[PDB]
Amino acid sequence: SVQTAATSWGTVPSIRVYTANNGKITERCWDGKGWYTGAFNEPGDNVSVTSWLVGSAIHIRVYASTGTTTTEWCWDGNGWTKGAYTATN
Amino acid sequence: SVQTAATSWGTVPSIRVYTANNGKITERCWDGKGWYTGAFNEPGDNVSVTSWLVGSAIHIRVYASTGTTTTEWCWDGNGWTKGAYTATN
Amino acid sequence: SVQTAATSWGTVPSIRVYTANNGKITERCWDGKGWYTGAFNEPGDNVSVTSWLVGSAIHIRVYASTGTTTTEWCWDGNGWTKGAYTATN
Ligand SMILES: CC(=O)N[C@H]1[C@H](O[C@@H]2[C@@H](O)[C@@H](O)O[C@H](CO)[C@@H]2O)O[C@H](CO)[C@@H](O[C@@H]2O[C@H](CO)[C@H](O)[C@H](O)[C@H]2O)[C@@H]1O[C@@H]1O[C@@H](C)[C@@H](O)[C@@H](O)[C@@H]1O
Numbered sequence: 001s002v003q004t005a006a007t008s009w010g011t012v013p014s015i016r017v018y019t020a021n022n023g024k025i026t027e028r029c030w031d032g033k034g035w036y037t038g039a040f041n042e043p044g045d046n047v048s049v050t051s052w053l054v055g056s057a058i059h060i061r062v063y064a065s066t067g068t069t070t071t072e073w074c075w076d077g078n079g080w081t082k083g084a085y086t087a088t089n
Numbered sequence: 090s091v092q093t094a095a096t097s098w099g100t101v102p103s104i105r106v107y108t109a110n111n112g113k114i115t116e117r118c119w120d121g122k123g124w125y126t127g128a129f130n131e132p133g134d135n136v137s138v139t140s141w142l143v144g145s146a147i148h149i150r151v152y153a154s155t156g157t158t159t160t161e162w163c164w165d166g167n168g169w170t171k172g173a174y175t176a177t178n
Numbered sequence: 179s180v181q182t183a184a185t186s187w188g189t190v191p192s193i194r195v196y197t198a199n200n201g202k203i204t205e206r207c208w209d210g211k212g213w214y215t216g217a218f219n220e221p222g223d224n225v226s227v228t229s230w231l232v233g234s235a236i237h238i239r240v241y242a243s244t245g246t247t248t249t250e251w252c253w254d255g256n257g258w259t260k261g262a263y264t265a266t267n
């Protein structure tokens with residue numbers, strides 16, 4: 001079965017759900033008006049997520065793992081970038 | 090091993106933990122006074138969760154997956170209902 | 179592949195990511211200045227997490243599962259202790 005991770009923010013709310021399937025992670029999004037597939041699409045067998053607000057601006061961190069490597073992906077308003085996280089050291 | 094997902098809200102806090110075991114998801118609840126088994130009991134091999142407050146009212150979304158199908162379950166004060174989420178399209 | 183769970187709080191933010199690998203869970207931490215390995219290191223094949231603030235104080239609950247047993251681990255400012263959670267009854 002596929003594996004999911006979810007986060008949400010505000011009172012509308014906005015929700016993001018990430019799904020790992022066959023080595024790829026896809027993103028589904030709700031901002032009050034319907035579900036749509038988001039811009040996040042990266043490799044991974046496993047996913048987790050967290051998010052926080054700075055005022056009205058959302059910041060999202062998605063942790064995508066394959067083997068023993070976890071890659072952090074970052075949303076800070078400007079598309080998906082890679083983060084400084086590593087699993088060790 | 091079983092697979093879990095957790096959410097919490099407020100300062101008491103309230104906590105909900107969902108566990109997928111043998112194709113079924115069960116719910117455990119803390120509201121400050123002890124752990125009890127919640128009303129949520131639905132099929133799934135995998136579970137994730139998120140929640141948010143609107144004032145003092147909690148809203149919970151549980152994403153239950155079997156195969157490639159993810160079903161969203163909703164708490165909005167009135168028992169568990171199904172949501173509009175789909176994994177694609 | 180390893181399995182992760184993530185939580186975050188405040189606006190800095192602080193982030194904690196828990197990774198289950200080969201029956202052990204380790205913790206990675208960000209408080210604004212770099213990633214470091216945290217004090218949490220306990221057995222588990224599966225992990226989930228939630229956290230909440232009471233004023234400026236973080237409280238973290240990590241649910242570590244092996245077989246059908248889920249152990250709750252608690253941070254309340256004073257190291258990692260075990261919680262009252264059980265999966266049933
Ligand atoms: C890739 C990275 O490590 N990003 C950092 C960010 O680094 C910047 C440098 O890469 C370079 O561009 O120089 C600038 C300053 O001149 C930065 O130092 O530094 C940020 C501030 O310390 C980190 O924090 C987040 O930054 C976001 C914008 O990128 C946004 O403002 C957010 O609110 C900040 O918390 C950023 O680290 C990334 O985010 C943190 C929370 C962790 O997830 C970390 O692993 C990420 O790499």
Ligand SMILES: CC(=O)N[C@H]1[C@H](O[C@@H]2[C@@H](O)[C@@H](O)O[C@H](CO)[C@@H]2O)O[C@H](CO)[C@@H](O[C@@H]2O[C@H](CO)[C@H](O)[C@H](O)[C@H]2O)[C@@H]1O[C@@H]1O[C@@H](C)[C@@H](O)[C@@H](O)[C@@H]1O
Pocket residue numbers: 012013015030032143148150161163165171172173174
């Ligand atoms: C099943 C569903 O899609 N629920 C929607 C809800 O739909 C209602 C219609 O089904 C019908 O009953 O007509 C009423 C209005 O006359 C609604 O349109 O519409 C809500 C408002 O847009 C959605 O948002 C949540 O609604 C909750 C009560 O059901 C509660 O008020 C909450 O605060 C609202 O955010 C609701 O969508 C569901 O919740 C959102 C957040 C997503 O999880 C979505 O996939 C869910 O279906």
Ligand SMILES: CC(=O)N[C@H]1[C@H](O[C@@H]2[C@@H](O)[C@@H](O)O[C@H](CO)[C@@H]2O)O[C@H](CO)[C@@H](O[C@@H]2O[C@H](CO)[C@H](O)[C@H](O)[C@H]2O)[C@@H]1O[C@@H]1O[C@@H](C)[C@@H](O)[C@@H](O)[C@@H]1O
Pocket residue numbers: 101102104119121232237239250252254260261262263
């Ligand atoms: C192990 C446990 O059940 N901890 C409880 C805590 O129990 C204490 C008793 O073990 C004994 O020491 O006596 C004192 C009072 O004299 C306590 O009753 O009781 C807390 C208050 O009800 C529980 O709540 C958290 O306590 C934290 C400090 O341990 C901290 O203050 C936090 O803000 C409180 O919510 C505590 O339960 C644990 O935390 C809750 C949220 C659940 O996760 C539960 O399963 C945990 O065991």
Ligand SMILES: CC(=O)N[C@@H]1[C@@H](O[C@@H]2O[C@@H](C)[C@@H](O)[C@@H](O)[C@@H]2O)[C@H](O[C@@H]2O[C@H](CO)[C@H](O)[C@H](O)[C@H]2O)[C@@H](CO)O[C@H]1O
Pocket residue numbers: 014016027029031036037038039040058075
């Ligand atoms: C802040 C916010 O909600 N931005 C929305 C856009 O991006 C989505 O949400 C963010 C937070 C991330 O989860 C993204 O991966 C996700 O797609 C969203 O999509 C953006 O649309 C642009 C066209 O309007 C463009 O295609 C861009 O590449 C894409 O990411 C749009 C609605 O589709 O709404 C924003 O509110």
Ligand SMILES: CC(=O)N[C@@H]1[C@@H](O[C@@H]2O[C@@H](C)[C@@H](O)[C@@H](O)[C@@H]2O)[C@H](O[C@@H]2O[C@H](CO)[C@H](O)[C@H](O)[C@H]2O)[C@@H](CO)O[C@H]1O
Pocket residue numbers: 103105116118120125126127128129147164
């Ligand atoms: C808001 C809240 O905490 N409601 C509690 C009731 O429901 C629990 O919590 C909600 C948020 C969901 O997680 C539920 O699945 C969960 O059970 C809770 O249980 C309800 O009890 C009723 C009898 O009082 C009735 O049996 C109902 O079917 C059941 O869902 C009760 C305590 O058991 O406390 C409420 O605070």
Ligand SMILES: CC(=O)N[C@@H]1[C@@H](O[C@@H]2O[C@@H](C)[C@@H](O)[C@@H](O)[C@@H]2O)[C@H](O[C@@H]2O[C@H](CO)[C@H](O)[C@H](O)[C@H]2O)[C@@H](CO)O[C@H]1O
Pocket residue numbers: 192194205207209214215216217218236253
């Ligand atoms: C509140 C806070 O951020 N405390 C930090 C210390 O502990 C870390 O964060 C807490 C919330 C848990 O996630 C811990 O498992 C995690 O390690 C942190 O580490 C502590 O350092 C002490 C020396 O300063 C000591 O070694 C202790 O055993 C250890 O847990 C320190 C920075 O390393 O920062 C605190 O802010």
Ligand SMILES: [Mg+2]
Pocket residue numbers: 005006007137138139
């Ligand atoms: Mg979540």
Ligand SMILES: [Mg+2]
Pocket residue numbers: 094095096226227228
């Ligand atoms: Mg959680």
Ligand SMILES: [Mg+2]
Pocket residue numbers: 048049050183184185
């Ligand atoms: Mg999380």
